[PDB]
Ligand binder design. Structure first.
Ligand SMILES: *C[C@@](*)(O)[C@H](Cc1ccccc1)NC(=O)[C@@H]1CCCN1C(=O)[C@H](C)NC(=O)[C@H](C)NC(=O)CCC(=O)O
Ligand SMILES: [Cu+2]
Ligand SMILES: [Cu+2]
Length: 224
């Protein structure tokens, strides 16, 4: 997260992290006791999912193994359209005051809405710096028309932009799959942006969750 601040402790119990052993790879959100929703480009052959703490490496944190991942059938490794994926938890996820289900959206929030994006991604760019504490930053949803003026052909269907005008406030490497929340509901998953991160007027791009609600449910309904 660029130009953000440490999230208030316990304000993100549905936030999870995908680790390659001990190193952060991506972020994600807990859908239920066995499902994590993250970015499709965050795919791994095996994951070590962090849950229950704002600090990576917390001794109290939960670390569950994952070997099954289900990317949206329409994901493109060339355009990154449909950048979302569900990862099945090998073991049950023990809920608590620090681990809760995320609230999926029932509709698409409109442009101009102020939202919060969070992650343990790099806080600097081009040079990389990874924080142990979960970082948060507020951004505003940008209309598809406005964003197309910036990215043109790079924008495909269900790609939601968010950012602050003339501001470095944005997501970056390691933040993918992480939640973009507005009004208590999940509106987006960090997908992509420009490099280096935090270029003013260069919006962060998110997978627009309100467009995949049916897919998310059916996929969890079919695989256990
Ligand atoms: C996977 C996730 O952690 C990461 C998060 C992120 C978000 C914003 C900025 C940087 C990183 N997302 C990515 O790494 C995604 C998926 C791989 C490609 N990617 C990018 O964000 C890259 C840096 N962006 C691009 O390639 C975009 C589409 N174009 C440009 O940067 C312009 C280059 C050109 O014109 O060819
Ligand atoms: Cu990695
Ligand atoms: Cu690419």
């Amino acid at each position: 997260i660029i130009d953000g601040a440490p999230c208030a402790r316990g304000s993100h119990p549905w936030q999870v992290a995908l680790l390659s052993g001990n190193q952060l790879h991506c972020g994600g959100v807990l859908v239920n006791e066995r499902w994590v929703l993250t970015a499709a480009h965050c795919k791994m052959n095996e994951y070590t999912v962090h849950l229950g703490s704002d600090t990576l490496g917390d001794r109290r944190a939960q670390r569950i193994k994952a070997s099954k991942s289900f990317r949206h059938p329409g994901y493109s490794t060339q355009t990154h359209v449909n950048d979302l994926m569900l990862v099945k938890l090998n073991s049950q996820a023990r809920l608590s005051s620090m681990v809760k289900k995320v609230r999926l959206p029932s509709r698409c929030e409109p442009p101009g809405t102020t939202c919060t994006v969070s992650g343990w991604g790099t806080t600097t760019s081009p040079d990389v710096t990874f924080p142990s504490d979960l970082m948060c930053v507020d951004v505003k949803l940008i209309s598809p028309q406005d964003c197309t003026k910036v990215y043109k052909d790079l924008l495909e269907n269900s790609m939601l932009c968010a950012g602050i005008p003339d501001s470095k406030k944005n997501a970056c490497n390691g933040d993918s799959g992480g939640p973009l929340v507005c009004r208590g509901t999940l509106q987006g998953l960090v997908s992509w942006g420009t490099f280096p991160c935090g270029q003013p007027n260069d919006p962060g791009v998110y997978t627009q969750v309100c467009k995949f609600t049916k897919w998310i449910n059916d996929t969890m309904k079919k695989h256990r």
